[PDB]
Ligand binder design. Structure first.
Ligand SMILES: COc1ccc(S(=O)(=O)NC(=O)c2cc3cc(OC)ccc3n2CC(=O)O)cc1
Ligand SMILES: COc1ccc(S(=O)(=O)NC(=O)c2cc3cc(OC)ccc3n2CC(=O)O)cc1
Ligand SMILES: COc1ccc(S(=O)(=O)NC(=O)c2cc3cc(OC)ccc3n2CC(=O)O)cc1
Lengths: 272, 283
């Protein structure tokens, strides 16, 4: 017996086996299964992922909410017309504790894997599990965590997963600051200074007609004009995060500490 | 999707091809059975295949791939002898990928097995099981079978694959098939061919030791282990690596009434393994 599912209602499952059965029942009735993974505390960036997923003709949207080791979140999803919320416990996800895991490739040891070297192993492990539980046709992630998104594409590619990975443009505040759950903690002076990250990147992207060095010098100047912004890295790479080619498409990534808050941002760059 | 000829042996090299045929088949309601092999097929593989064949409306996929990542040049390869037997058994799909198609980016994302992988066969081979679980995951994702078949001979490997499948929520049933033996009890293996006639005669000691322990066990674990050791010790040119009695999941738990006795031994340059279910005291 397939667990109950009521079309056009918010259906909330906590059992991995339950969401798996429903997703399979749906896939067999025609629906295209779309997965939006979240650690909850939903914001406009999640709603953008949901609207992207909702656009696909015949979609049923699954939003997972799992804090990788509420009433409001569900209300937000209902207001978006999401049909499934997957909300498992730690024990349901890890009934045998930590055992088999994903070892990311070398990219995980670079950039954000510098301060957090086992972060991405955790992330790719739980993403792989959610993909196997729900078996979506498409999985939606924001572009803010760029290195993570690239490592997920590598996961998908390396383990031959049959899922399209869709990166959705980062939703930003009125002044460009990338949506983040860390932003609410900035005092007004930190919050005014944080704008330098996206200002630096958008300056870089426009300076890039003048080449790579001008793009980087432009970003760096903008960061140098902000007080209390401790830059951990500022790096131009190819879109896959390998070495930036002579000319061509790239990505510019920055990370910085503002008091106790670590902020990240990144942007598409085109050289010359 | 490529040509599939039913009732015929269809050979596919490209992952995308076998993936599409397999998907096509499952939507027609055929159940997809996978027998992963490293080629050089013997009667143990045929038994894996026959088990897969008896699943109703099954279509059977046998994959043949020598994975560089679990090691290599020495390994037995005989694809002429491999595909002939598959046709003879009525297997309809052989999946024979190239190293390039499987590892176009080299080794990058890999499976890190649990701590079982550092024990027994993994002790002196630290990344061996990481290589095995990665290839098995990739084959499962390419073929997406309903059930996958393994022999019980490489028991530690089978337990690790069960872990892989539970730990990554894979939608596949793992089937262990009792180890096929030569008529003296020697466990089928690709490595047997490397035994000279002296060594082949001596090699009966591993299975003799195991069956001895299994009946010795009414008198307890020490008696079972001591009987096995004596049989191994009485055997010419058998150098024992390990001889270990564990719980059936091999894992972070003692032993109850029931478990698994595992032996690895060297005959000249050839390493032989075997194992058996053991019941201690009552059972
Ligand atoms: C063939 O007759 C039909 C087909 C579809 C519908 S419906 O209004 O679009 N509802 C469903 O299709 C539907 C119900 C349903 C229940 C399930 O678990 C109990 C799982 C999937 C279900 N579906 C498919 C869907 O919502 O698209 C109603 C009647
Ligand atoms: C393993 O993959 C995930 C997926 C989602 C999360 S999360 O912590 O719930 N969500 C976010 O991190 C998040 C999503 C998002 C989307 C955006 O635009 C579409 C912009 C920013 C986003 N964030 C940033 C944040 O919340 O810190 C975390 C890890
Ligand atoms: C990664 O998972 C696998 C799966 C199969 C192989 S293999 O080298 O082609 N085959 C075996 O190792 C094997 C299968 C088998 C079956 C048996 O009876 C059912 C008995 C022994 C078996 N072997 C042992 C062997 O060939 O050494 C190798 C690795």
């Amino acid at each position: 017996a397939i667990p109950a599912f009521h079309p056009g209602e918010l259906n909330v499952y906590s059992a991995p086996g339950d969401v798996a059965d429903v997703s399979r029942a749906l896939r067999l009735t025609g629906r295209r299964v779309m997965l939006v993974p979240t650690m909850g505390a939903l914001h406009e960036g999640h709603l953008a992922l949901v609207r992207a997923a909702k656009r696909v003709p015949g979609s049923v949207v699954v939003v997972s909410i799992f804090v990788n080791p509420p009433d409001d979140d569900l209300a937000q999803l209902r207001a978006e017309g999401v049909e499934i919320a997957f909300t498992p416990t730690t024990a349901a996800m890890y009934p045998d504790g930590l055992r088999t895991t994903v070892q990311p490739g070398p990219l995980a040891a670079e950039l954000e894997g510098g301060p957090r070297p086992t972060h991405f192993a955790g992330v790719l492990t739980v993403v792989l599990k959610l993909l196997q539980i729900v078996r979506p046709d498409r999985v939606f992630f924001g572009e803010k965590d760029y290195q993570q998104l690239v490592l997920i594409r590598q996961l998908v590619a390396d383990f031959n997963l049959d899922v399209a990975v869709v990166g959705v443009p980062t939703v930003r505040e009125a002044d460009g600051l990338a949506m983040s759950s860390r932003n609410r903690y900035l005092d007004p002076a930190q919050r005014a200074a944080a704008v330098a990250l996206s200002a630096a990147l958008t300056a870089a992207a426009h300076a890039a007609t003048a080449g790579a060095q001008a793009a980087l010098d432009a970003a760096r100047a903008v960061l140098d004009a902000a007080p209390g912004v401790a830059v951990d890295y500022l790096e131009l790479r190819d879109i896959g995060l390998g070495p930036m080619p002579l000319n061509g498409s790239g990505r510019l990534l920055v990370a910085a500490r503002l008091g106790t808050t670590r902020l990240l941002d990144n942007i598409a760059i085109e050289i010359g």
